[PDB]
Amino acid sequence: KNVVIYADGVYDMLHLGHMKQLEQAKKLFENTTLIVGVTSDNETKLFKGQVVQTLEERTETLKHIRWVDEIISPCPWVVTPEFLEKYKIDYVAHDDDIYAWLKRAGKFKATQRTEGVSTTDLIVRILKNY
Amino acid sequence: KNVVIYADGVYDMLHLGHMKQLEQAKKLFENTTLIVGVTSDNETKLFKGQVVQTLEERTETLKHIRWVDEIISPCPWVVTPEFLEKYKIDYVAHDDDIYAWLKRAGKFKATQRTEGVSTTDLIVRILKNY
C-alpha cells in the first residue's frame, strides 16, 4: 500500500511555497514515502543559475520538514528510467517537456506552486517601510 | 511516559537556528509532546520590536516543521503557573531572570541557540558578491 514519491529540486532558501508543495507530494496517496532530491551546487549553477545556499545548507533545512521521509543529496540533475528502478520510485512529483516520458508511463504527479511567499518578497516588505 | 514540553517565541522568518532549537526541545525526553507558542503581533512590537511576518505567517511555517506537535497561537507573552496547569505542561524549553521561578520549580529546560544561520545573514552573502 506504500507508494514511493520522488520530488527533486534546488530547495534554495526554503519558504512556505516549497513546504506546501512538499506537503502535496507527501499527501498524493494515503500511505507514502516521500524521497526528496537536492540538486548539486555545480549543476544548479551550470543549468539554472546562481544558488544562494550550499548543497549542505539546503539539505539540512529539509531534514527539519515534516513531510520529508528520505533525502537523496546530491541527486541527479535529470531523472532517468534506471533511477526510478534503482530507488523503486512509483511517481515523480513536480509542478507542471522534460516530464513527457514520465506522463507517458503513468509516473508523473502534478503539485502546485505558491507565489509571493519567498524570502525575496519578505525583505521587500522590510525595506518598503523606509 | 509522555512529557509535555512548551517552547514559546516569536519565530519570525524561521531559519535553521529556530529549527535545531525546536529539535532539541522535542528530544529533551524519549517520549514528548512539543507545544510551540507563537507571540502576538501587537505584543512583540510593544516589548521586543518590529516583527517581519504576521502571526498567521509565522504560525503557518511552524506547521510544516517535523518537531512541532501542537501550536498555541497566539500565546501569552509571559508564562504563568496557571498556564502550565491549564495545558498540563511539564517543562518550558528556552535558551538560557524571567525563568527563575521555572528553575526553582524544576520546570525549566535549557536549549541552545545557533548563530550565523539567519535570513539576514543570507542576503549579506548575496550582496557581498557585488
PDB file of C-alpha atoms in Angstrom:
ATOM      1  CA  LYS A   1       0.000   0.000   0.000  1.00  0.00           C
ATOM      2  CA  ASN A   2       3.055   2.238   0.381  1.00  0.00           C
ATOM      3  CA  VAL A   3       3.666   4.485  -2.641  1.00  0.00           C
ATOM      4  CA  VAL A   4       7.173   5.920  -3.139  1.00  0.00           C
ATOM      5  CA  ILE A   5       7.098   9.571  -4.309  1.00  0.00           C
ATOM      6  CA  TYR A   6      10.200  11.423  -5.572  1.00  0.00           C
ATOM      7  CA  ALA A   7      10.370  15.237  -5.570  1.00  0.00           C
ATOM      8  CA  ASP A   8      13.586  16.827  -6.803  1.00  0.00           C
ATOM      9  CA  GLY A   9      14.592  20.464  -6.756  1.00  0.00           C
ATOM     10  CA  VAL A  10      17.095  23.069  -5.708  1.00  0.00           C
ATOM     11  CA  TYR A  11      15.259  23.955  -2.472  1.00  0.00           C
ATOM     12  CA  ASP A  12      17.244  27.186  -2.121  1.00  0.00           C
ATOM     13  CA  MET A  13      16.259  29.381   0.845  1.00  0.00           C
ATOM     14  CA  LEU A  14      13.263  27.193   1.640  1.00  0.00           C
ATOM     15  CA  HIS A  15       9.960  29.010   2.183  1.00  0.00           C
ATOM     16  CA  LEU A  16       6.244  28.327   2.636  1.00  0.00           C
ATOM     17  CA  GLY A  17       5.940  27.706  -1.099  1.00  0.00           C
ATOM     18  CA  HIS A  18       8.420  24.823  -1.036  1.00  0.00           C
ATOM     19  CA  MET A  19       6.822  23.431   2.109  1.00  0.00           C
ATOM     20  CA  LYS A  20       3.237  23.406   0.829  1.00  0.00           C
ATOM     21  CA  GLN A  21       4.490  21.706  -2.333  1.00  0.00           C
ATOM     22  CA  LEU A  22       6.265  19.010  -0.328  1.00  0.00           C
ATOM     23  CA  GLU A  23       3.095  18.558   1.721  1.00  0.00           C
ATOM     24  CA  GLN A  24       1.161  17.992  -1.525  1.00  0.00           C
ATOM     25  CA  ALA A  25       3.606  15.375  -2.810  1.00  0.00           C
ATOM     26  CA  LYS A  26       3.567  13.585   0.559  1.00  0.00           C
ATOM     27  CA  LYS A  27      -0.255  13.512   0.547  1.00  0.00           C
ATOM     28  CA  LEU A  28      -0.652  12.265  -3.034  1.00  0.00           C
ATOM     29  CA  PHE A  29      -1.729   8.866  -1.661  1.00  0.00           C
ATOM     30  CA  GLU A  30      -2.901   7.672   1.737  1.00  0.00           C
ATOM     31  CA  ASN A  31       0.382   5.830   2.507  1.00  0.00           C
ATOM     32  CA  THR A  32       3.589   7.255   1.032  1.00  0.00           C
ATOM     33  CA  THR A  33       7.320   7.581   1.398  1.00  0.00           C
ATOM     34  CA  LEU A  34       8.428  10.989   0.087  1.00  0.00           C
ATOM     35  CA  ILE A  35      12.030  10.967  -1.185  1.00  0.00           C
ATOM     36  CA  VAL A  36      13.377  14.492  -1.830  1.00  0.00           C
ATOM     37  CA  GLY A  37      16.283  15.055  -4.210  1.00  0.00           C
ATOM     38  CA  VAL A  38      18.553  18.071  -3.751  1.00  0.00           C
ATOM     39  CA  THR A  39      20.475  19.243  -6.814  1.00  0.00           C
ATOM     40  CA  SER A  40      24.253  19.753  -6.671  1.00  0.00           C
ATOM     41  CA  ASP A  41      25.825  23.222  -6.477  1.00  0.00           C
ATOM     42  CA  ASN A  42      27.817  22.828  -9.686  1.00  0.00           C
ATOM     43  CA  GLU A  43      24.904  21.623 -11.809  1.00  0.00           C
ATOM     44  CA  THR A  44      22.444  24.188 -10.445  1.00  0.00           C
ATOM     45  CA  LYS A  45      24.853  26.996 -11.287  1.00  0.00           C
ATOM     46  CA  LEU A  46      25.556  25.495 -14.710  1.00  0.00           C
ATOM     47  CA  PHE A  47      21.948  24.945 -15.841  1.00  0.00           C
ATOM     48  CA  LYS A  48      19.636  27.137 -13.718  1.00  0.00           C
ATOM     49  CA  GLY A  49      21.759  29.916 -12.257  1.00  0.00           C
ATOM     50  CA  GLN A  50      23.184  31.251  -9.030  1.00  0.00           C
ATOM     51  CA  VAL A  51      22.295  29.284  -5.899  1.00  0.00           C
ATOM     52  CA  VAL A  52      22.445  31.038  -2.541  1.00  0.00           C
ATOM     53  CA  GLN A  53      22.829  28.168  -0.060  1.00  0.00           C
ATOM     54  CA  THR A  54      25.309  25.335  -0.496  1.00  0.00           C
ATOM     55  CA  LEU A  55      24.190  21.755  -1.021  1.00  0.00           C
ATOM     56  CA  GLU A  56      24.836  21.067   2.651  1.00  0.00           C
ATOM     57  CA  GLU A  57      22.773  24.033   3.864  1.00  0.00           C
ATOM     58  CA  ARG A  58      19.856  23.298   1.532  1.00  0.00           C
ATOM     59  CA  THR A  59      19.880  19.641   2.589  1.00  0.00           C
ATOM     60  CA  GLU A  60      19.985  20.335   6.314  1.00  0.00           C
ATOM     61  CA  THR A  61      16.891  22.554   6.228  1.00  0.00           C
ATOM     62  CA  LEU A  62      14.917  19.779   4.508  1.00  0.00           C
ATOM     63  CA  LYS A  63      15.766  17.407   7.341  1.00  0.00           C
ATOM     64  CA  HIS A  64      13.568  19.530   9.643  1.00  0.00           C
ATOM     65  CA  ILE A  65      10.465  19.408   7.380  1.00  0.00           C
ATOM     66  CA  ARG A  66       7.611  17.151   8.480  1.00  0.00           C
ATOM     67  CA  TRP A  67       6.683  15.789   5.043  1.00  0.00           C
ATOM     68  CA  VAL A  68      10.221  14.654   4.118  1.00  0.00           C
ATOM     69  CA  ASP A  69      10.854  10.954   4.737  1.00  0.00           C
ATOM     70  CA  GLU A  70      14.116  10.360   2.832  1.00  0.00           C
ATOM     71  CA  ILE A  71      16.678  12.581   1.103  1.00  0.00           C
ATOM     72  CA  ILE A  72      18.934  11.939  -1.878  1.00  0.00           C
ATOM     73  CA  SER A  73      21.674  14.607  -1.762  1.00  0.00           C
ATOM     74  CA  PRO A  74      23.104  15.337  -4.179  1.00  0.00           C
ATOM     75  CA  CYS A  75      20.535  13.993  -6.621  1.00  0.00           C
ATOM     76  CA  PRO A  76      20.912  13.602 -10.380  1.00  0.00           C
ATOM     77  CA  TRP A  77      20.027  16.671 -12.414  1.00  0.00           C
ATOM     78  CA  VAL A  78      17.848  14.692 -14.872  1.00  0.00           C
ATOM     79  CA  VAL A  79      15.618  11.811 -13.796  1.00  0.00           C
ATOM     80  CA  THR A  80      16.120   8.579 -15.748  1.00  0.00           C
ATOM     81  CA  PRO A  81      14.165   5.321 -16.030  1.00  0.00           C
ATOM     82  CA  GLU A  82      17.079   3.460 -14.422  1.00  0.00           C
ATOM     83  CA  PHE A  83      16.988   5.882 -11.491  1.00  0.00           C
ATOM     84  CA  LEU A  84      13.303   5.159 -10.871  1.00  0.00           C
ATOM     85  CA  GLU A  85      14.030   1.435 -10.822  1.00  0.00           C
ATOM     86  CA  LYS A  86      17.111   1.650  -8.587  1.00  0.00           C
ATOM     87  CA  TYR A  87      15.187   3.532  -5.869  1.00  0.00           C
ATOM     88  CA  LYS A  88      11.817   1.806  -6.558  1.00  0.00           C
ATOM     89  CA  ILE A  89      10.134   5.156  -7.215  1.00  0.00           C
ATOM     90  CA  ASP A  90       6.456   4.949  -8.191  1.00  0.00           C
ATOM     91  CA  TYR A  91       5.813   8.609  -9.149  1.00  0.00           C
ATOM     92  CA  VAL A  92       7.760  11.834  -9.680  1.00  0.00           C
ATOM     93  CA  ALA A  93       6.024  14.883  -8.179  1.00  0.00           C
ATOM     94  CA  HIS A  94       6.729  18.293  -9.725  1.00  0.00           C
ATOM     95  CA  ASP A  95       4.846  21.421 -10.711  1.00  0.00           C
ATOM     96  CA  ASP A  96       3.525  21.151 -14.260  1.00  0.00           C
ATOM     97  CA  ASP A  97       8.514  18.922 -21.821  1.00  0.00           C
ATOM     98  CA  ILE A  98      11.113  17.114 -19.705  1.00  0.00           C
ATOM     99  CA  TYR A  99       8.347  15.132 -17.974  1.00  0.00           C
ATOM    100  CA  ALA A 100       6.646  13.834 -21.142  1.00  0.00           C
ATOM    101  CA  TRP A 101       8.222  10.395 -20.780  1.00  0.00           C
ATOM    102  CA  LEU A 102       7.047  10.271 -17.158  1.00  0.00           C
ATOM    103  CA  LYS A 103       3.460  11.160 -18.063  1.00  0.00           C
ATOM    104  CA  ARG A 104       3.519   8.586 -20.857  1.00  0.00           C
ATOM    105  CA  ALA A 105       4.476   5.933 -18.321  1.00  0.00           C
ATOM    106  CA  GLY A 106       1.825   6.890 -15.734  1.00  0.00           C
ATOM    107  CA  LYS A 107       4.538   8.044 -13.333  1.00  0.00           C
ATOM    108  CA  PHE A 108       4.037  11.843 -13.170  1.00  0.00           C
ATOM    109  CA  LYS A 109       2.132  13.620 -10.388  1.00  0.00           C
ATOM    110  CA  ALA A 110       1.458  17.352 -10.571  1.00  0.00           C
ATOM    111  CA  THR A 111       1.956  19.539  -7.499  1.00  0.00           C
ATOM    112  CA  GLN A 112       1.196  23.247  -7.315  1.00  0.00           C
ATOM    113  CA  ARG A 113       3.409  26.261  -6.676  1.00  0.00           C
ATOM    114  CA  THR A 114       2.721  29.020  -4.152  1.00  0.00           C
ATOM    115  CA  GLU A 115       3.765  32.513  -5.201  1.00  0.00           C
ATOM    116  CA  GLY A 116       4.585  35.644  -3.238  1.00  0.00           C
ATOM    117  CA  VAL A 117       5.867  33.766  -0.166  1.00  0.00           C
ATOM    118  CA  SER A 118       9.569  33.834  -0.979  1.00  0.00           C
ATOM    119  CA  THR A 119      12.469  35.169   1.059  1.00  0.00           C
ATOM    120  CA  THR A 120      12.982  37.832  -1.610  1.00  0.00           C
ATOM    121  CA  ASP A 121       9.398  39.014  -1.143  1.00  0.00           C
ATOM    122  CA  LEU A 122       9.975  39.403   2.609  1.00  0.00           C
ATOM    123  CA  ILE A 123      12.931  41.800   2.560  1.00  0.00           C
ATOM    124  CA  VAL A 124      10.973  43.895   0.057  1.00  0.00           C
ATOM    125  CA  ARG A 125       8.363  44.225   2.800  1.00  0.00           C
ATOM    126  CA  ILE A 126      11.120  45.180   5.253  1.00  0.00           C
ATOM    127  CA  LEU A 127      12.540  47.950   3.074  1.00  0.00           C
ATOM    128  CA  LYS A 128       9.151  49.245   1.884  1.00  0.00           C
ATOM    129  CA  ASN A 129       8.971  50.676   5.429  1.00  0.00           C
ATOM    130  CA  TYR A 130      11.754  53.194   4.740  1.00  0.00           C
TER     131      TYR A 130
ATOM    132  CA  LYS B   1       5.862   8.362  29.980  1.00  0.00           C
ATOM    133  CA  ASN B   2       4.841  11.282  27.763  1.00  0.00           C
ATOM    134  CA  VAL B   3       6.421  14.594  28.806  1.00  0.00           C
ATOM    135  CA  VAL B   4       4.756  17.831  27.641  1.00  0.00           C
ATOM    136  CA  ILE B   5       7.314  20.479  26.569  1.00  0.00           C
ATOM    137  CA  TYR B   6       6.379  24.124  25.874  1.00  0.00           C
ATOM    138  CA  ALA B   7       8.596  26.364  23.717  1.00  0.00           C
ATOM    139  CA  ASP B   8       7.407  29.916  23.120  1.00  0.00           C
ATOM    140  CA  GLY B   9       8.872  32.544  20.842  1.00  0.00           C
ATOM    141  CA  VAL B  10       8.347  34.960  18.007  1.00  0.00           C
ATOM    142  CA  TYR B  11       9.575  32.531  15.320  1.00  0.00           C
ATOM    143  CA  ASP B  12       9.981  35.365  12.810  1.00  0.00           C
ATOM    144  CA  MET B  13      11.428  34.341   9.427  1.00  0.00           C
ATOM    145  CA  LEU B  14      12.178  30.832  10.660  1.00  0.00           C
ATOM    146  CA  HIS B  15      15.679  29.516   9.939  1.00  0.00           C
ATOM    147  CA  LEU B  16      17.975  26.598  10.768  1.00  0.00           C
ATOM    148  CA  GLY B  17      18.641  28.136  14.176  1.00  0.00           C
ATOM    149  CA  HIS B  18      14.975  28.012  15.184  1.00  0.00           C
ATOM    150  CA  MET B  19      14.641  24.505  13.783  1.00  0.00           C
ATOM    151  CA  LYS B  20      17.622  22.996  15.608  1.00  0.00           C
ATOM    152  CA  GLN B  21      16.319  24.571  18.815  1.00  0.00           C
ATOM    153  CA  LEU B  22      12.878  23.040  18.316  1.00  0.00           C
ATOM    154  CA  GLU B  23      14.553  19.700  17.616  1.00  0.00           C
ATOM    155  CA  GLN B  24      16.381  19.995  20.958  1.00  0.00           C
ATOM    156  CA  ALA B  25      13.201  20.748  22.907  1.00  0.00           C
ATOM    157  CA  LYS B  26      11.392  17.851  21.207  1.00  0.00           C
ATOM    158  CA  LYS B  27      14.245  15.467  22.094  1.00  0.00           C
ATOM    159  CA  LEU B  28      14.562  16.513  25.746  1.00  0.00           C
ATOM    160  CA  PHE B  29      12.988  13.185  26.768  1.00  0.00           C
ATOM    161  CA  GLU B  30      12.398   9.908  24.961  1.00  0.00           C
ATOM    162  CA  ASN B  31       8.609  10.469  24.648  1.00  0.00           C
ATOM    163  CA  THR B  32       7.378  14.058  24.338  1.00  0.00           C
ATOM    164  CA  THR B  33       4.673  16.332  23.046  1.00  0.00           C
ATOM    165  CA  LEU B  34       6.216  19.649  21.962  1.00  0.00           C
ATOM    166  CA  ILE B  35       3.752  22.558  22.207  1.00  0.00           C
ATOM    167  CA  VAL B  36       5.041  25.718  20.472  1.00  0.00           C
ATOM    168  CA  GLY B  37       3.707  29.142  21.433  1.00  0.00           C
ATOM    169  CA  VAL B  38       3.741  31.972  18.893  1.00  0.00           C
ATOM    170  CA  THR B  39       3.676  35.511  20.279  1.00  0.00           C
ATOM    171  CA  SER B  40       1.097  38.040  19.053  1.00  0.00           C
ATOM    172  CA  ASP B  41       1.997  40.841  16.627  1.00  0.00           C
ATOM    173  CA  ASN B  42       0.948  43.628  18.985  1.00  0.00           C
ATOM    174  CA  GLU B  43       2.878  42.341  21.995  1.00  0.00           C
ATOM    175  CA  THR B  44       6.021  41.507  20.015  1.00  0.00           C
ATOM    176  CA  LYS B  45       6.107  45.027  18.603  1.00  0.00           C
ATOM    177  CA  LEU B  46       5.400  46.521  22.029  1.00  0.00           C
ATOM    178  CA  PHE B  47       8.043  44.622  24.032  1.00  0.00           C
ATOM    179  CA  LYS B  48      10.678  43.249  21.618  1.00  0.00           C
ATOM    180  CA  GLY B  49      10.459  45.298  18.437  1.00  0.00           C
ATOM    181  CA  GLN B  50       9.493  45.130  14.795  1.00  0.00           C
ATOM    182  CA  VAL B  51       8.272  41.744  13.570  1.00  0.00           C
ATOM    183  CA  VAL B  52       8.502  40.953   9.869  1.00  0.00           C
ATOM    184  CA  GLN B  53       5.904  38.205   9.388  1.00  0.00           C
ATOM    185  CA  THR B  54       2.377  38.386  10.768  1.00  0.00           C
ATOM    186  CA  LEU B  55       1.139  35.985  13.423  1.00  0.00           C
ATOM    187  CA  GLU B  56      -0.578  33.957  10.717  1.00  0.00           C
ATOM    188  CA  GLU B  57       2.544  33.676   8.548  1.00  0.00           C
ATOM    189  CA  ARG B  58       4.812  32.766  11.466  1.00  0.00           C
ATOM    190  CA  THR B  59       2.313  30.146  12.644  1.00  0.00           C
ATOM    191  CA  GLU B  60       1.845  28.531   9.246  1.00  0.00           C
ATOM    192  CA  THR B  61       5.572  27.918   8.760  1.00  0.00           C
ATOM    193  CA  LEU B  62       5.738  26.106  12.114  1.00  0.00           C
ATOM    194  CA  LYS B  63       3.016  23.727  10.972  1.00  0.00           C
ATOM    195  CA  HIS B  64       5.482  22.285   8.427  1.00  0.00           C
ATOM    196  CA  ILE B  65       8.253  21.565  10.990  1.00  0.00           C
ATOM    197  CA  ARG B  66       8.786  17.936  11.987  1.00  0.00           C
ATOM    198  CA  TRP B  67       9.405  18.511  15.703  1.00  0.00           C
ATOM    199  CA  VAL B  68       6.229  20.565  16.301  1.00  0.00           C
ATOM    200  CA  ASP B  69       3.339  18.539  17.721  1.00  0.00           C
ATOM    201  CA  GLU B  70       0.919  21.271  18.864  1.00  0.00           C
ATOM    202  CA  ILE B  71       0.723  25.050  18.457  1.00  0.00           C
ATOM    203  CA  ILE B  72      -0.728  27.733  20.712  1.00  0.00           C
ATOM    204  CA  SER B  73      -1.189  30.848  18.537  1.00  0.00           C
ATOM    205  CA  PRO B  74      -1.294  33.477  19.759  1.00  0.00           C
ATOM    206  CA  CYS B  75       0.360  32.501  23.026  1.00  0.00           C
ATOM    207  CA  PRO B  76       0.657  34.602  26.176  1.00  0.00           C
ATOM    208  CA  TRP B  77       3.660  36.906  26.298  1.00  0.00           C
ATOM    209  CA  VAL B  78       4.632  35.822  29.846  1.00  0.00           C
ATOM    210  CA  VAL B  79       4.314  32.240  31.071  1.00  0.00           C
ATOM    211  CA  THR B  80       2.374  31.824  34.321  1.00  0.00           C
ATOM    212  CA  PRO B  81       1.913  28.954  36.785  1.00  0.00           C
ATOM    213  CA  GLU B  82      -1.791  28.811  35.891  1.00  0.00           C
ATOM    214  CA  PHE B  83      -0.875  28.484  32.214  1.00  0.00           C
ATOM    215  CA  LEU B  84       1.337  25.468  32.925  1.00  0.00           C
ATOM    216  CA  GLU B  85      -1.515  23.803  34.794  1.00  0.00           C
ATOM    217  CA  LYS B  86      -4.206  24.577  32.207  1.00  0.00           C
ATOM    218  CA  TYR B  87      -2.186  22.938  29.403  1.00  0.00           C
ATOM    219  CA  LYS B  88      -0.544  20.282  31.652  1.00  0.00           C
ATOM    220  CA  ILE B  89       2.935  21.487  30.688  1.00  0.00           C
ATOM    221  CA  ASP B  90       5.808  19.652  32.391  1.00  0.00           C
ATOM    222  CA  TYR B  91       8.755  21.837  31.267  1.00  0.00           C
ATOM    223  CA  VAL B  92       9.380  25.135  29.476  1.00  0.00           C
ATOM    224  CA  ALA B  93      12.242  24.941  26.959  1.00  0.00           C
ATOM    225  CA  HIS B  94      14.143  28.143  26.151  1.00  0.00           C
ATOM    226  CA  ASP B  95      17.709  29.282  25.617  1.00  0.00           C
ATOM    227  CA  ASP B  96      19.320  30.291  28.904  1.00  0.00           C
ATOM    228  CA  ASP B  97      15.826  36.309  35.115  1.00  0.00           C
ATOM    229  CA  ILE B  98      12.282  35.720  33.853  1.00  0.00           C
ATOM    230  CA  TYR B  99      12.779  31.948  34.170  1.00  0.00           C
ATOM    231  CA  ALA B 100      13.963  31.935  37.805  1.00  0.00           C
ATOM    232  CA  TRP B 101      10.575  30.778  39.079  1.00  0.00           C
ATOM    233  CA  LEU B 102      10.596  27.974  36.500  1.00  0.00           C
ATOM    234  CA  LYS B 103      14.058  26.769  37.518  1.00  0.00           C
ATOM    235  CA  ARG B 104      13.043  26.915  41.176  1.00  0.00           C
ATOM    236  CA  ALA B 105      10.130  24.611  40.405  1.00  0.00           C
ATOM    237  CA  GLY B 106      12.161  22.080  38.378  1.00  0.00           C
ATOM    238  CA  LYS B 107      10.290  23.061  35.217  1.00  0.00           C
ATOM    239  CA  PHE B 108      12.970  24.788  33.086  1.00  0.00           C
ATOM    240  CA  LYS B 109      14.897  23.067  30.284  1.00  0.00           C
ATOM    241  CA  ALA B 110      17.742  24.844  28.506  1.00  0.00           C
ATOM    242  CA  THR B 111      18.038  24.669  24.718  1.00  0.00           C
ATOM    243  CA  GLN B 112      20.854  26.175  22.678  1.00  0.00           C
ATOM    244  CA  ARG B 113      20.891  28.869  20.007  1.00  0.00           C
ATOM    245  CA  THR B 114      22.556  28.588  16.600  1.00  0.00           C
ATOM    246  CA  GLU B 115      24.143  31.768  15.274  1.00  0.00           C
ATOM    247  CA  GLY B 116      25.017  32.936  11.780  1.00  0.00           C
ATOM    248  CA  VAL B 117      22.218  30.967  10.078  1.00  0.00           C
ATOM    249  CA  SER B 118      19.634  33.733   9.882  1.00  0.00           C
ATOM    250  CA  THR B 119      17.812  35.132   6.870  1.00  0.00           C
ATOM    251  CA  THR B 120      19.646  38.420   7.420  1.00  0.00           C
ATOM    252  CA  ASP B 121      22.984  36.619   7.175  1.00  0.00           C
ATOM    253  CA  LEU B 122      21.965  35.107   3.822  1.00  0.00           C
ATOM    254  CA  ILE B 123      21.211  38.295   1.883  1.00  0.00           C
ATOM    255  CA  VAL B 124      24.531  39.653   3.157  1.00  0.00           C
ATOM    256  CA  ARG B 125      26.110  36.710   1.344  1.00  0.00           C
ATOM    257  CA  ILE B 126      24.072  37.578  -1.758  1.00  0.00           C
ATOM    258  CA  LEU B 127      25.177  41.212  -1.859  1.00  0.00           C
ATOM    259  CA  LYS B 128      28.801  40.514  -0.882  1.00  0.00           C
ATOM    260  CA  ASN B 129      29.041  39.235  -4.481  1.00  0.00           C
ATOM    261  CA  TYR B 130      28.632  42.739  -5.936  1.00  0.00           C
TER     262      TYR B 130
END
